[PDB]
Structures are given as C-alpha cells and as structure tokens.
C-alpha cells in the first residue's frame, strides 16, 4: 500500500511565496476568481478589482491532461506570456507559468503568478490557499 501523505499532486505554485498555492486535485474542476462561487477565492488588498469574480477554470481534459481556460476575464490569463483566447481550452505542462490579470504601473510582475508543477504533497500542503 501507500500513504496519502507520500503522494504527489499537480498544483499552481504561487511564484515568490510559500503561501497561496492552488491544488489541482485529480478528477476535480478548480475554479479561481474573487467572487464567492469559486474553488479558490483570491482576495487582493493591493488591487481588489484586478481579478474577475469568475476568472479561470482548470480541469483535466478527456485524455487526463490538466488544462486552463480564461472565463471571459476582464484583465486576462497569460500562459507563458501569451494571452489566452477567452473560453479556449489550453493544455498546461510542467514548468509553465500562468499570470492572472496584469502588472500594475511600475511593477515587473502581476500579483497572481503561478508555476504549473507536480510536487510532493509534503511540499505542497503547508503552502496551500484555503478552499473557499
């Protein structure tokens, strides 16, 4: 057998932080936004209204591959810098970077940037955002 604690999972690792990571739980749909219906509610003090109420959706496709989709967000989703077309489904891979929204004036990076990565559960769990 095998302990759950020794497991692995895909996740969105919050760049620059050991907090705010988002779990991509096998077999689940993961929605992200600032509204109250979503799996992970983002709350920004820096710029409350950058992120859309329902900003993006992550889910495995019929082949079992994780994907992301921009849910008609106002300020966009970027996969390695390329702006995603709203509602088109894009496969996401180890090492990909996802940006939600855009950098503010005189800022190098958007607040919400993630690396798509498969990591040990022991690494991920202390860093996860609470579920909404």
């Amino acid at each position: 057998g095998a302990h759950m604690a020794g497991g692995r999972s895909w996740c969105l690792r919050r760049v620059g932080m050991s907090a705010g990571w988002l779990l991509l739980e096998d077999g689940c749909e993961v929605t992200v936004g600032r509204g109250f219906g979503v799996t992970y509610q983002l709350v920004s003090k820096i710029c409350p209204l950058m992120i859309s109420r329902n900003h993006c959706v992550l889910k495995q496709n019929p082949e079992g591959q994780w994907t992301i989709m921009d849910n008609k967000s106002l300020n966009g989703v970027w996969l390695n810098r390329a702006r995603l077309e709203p509602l088109r489904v894009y496969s996401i891979h180890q090492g990909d970077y996802i940006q939600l929204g855009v950098p503010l004036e005189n800022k190098e990076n958007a607040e919400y940037e993630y690396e798509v990565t498969e990591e040990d559960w022991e690494t991920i769990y202390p860093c996860l955002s609470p579920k909404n």
Binding site: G35, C47, P48, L49, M50, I51, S52, R53, S73, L74, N75, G101, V102, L104
Partner: peptide
Amino acid sequence: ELKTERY
C-alpha cells in the same frame, strides 16, 4: 458586488 476594473 463590485464590477471588475480594467487595468
């Protein structure tokens, strides 16, 4: 709710 703002 407040609508999202464009940046």
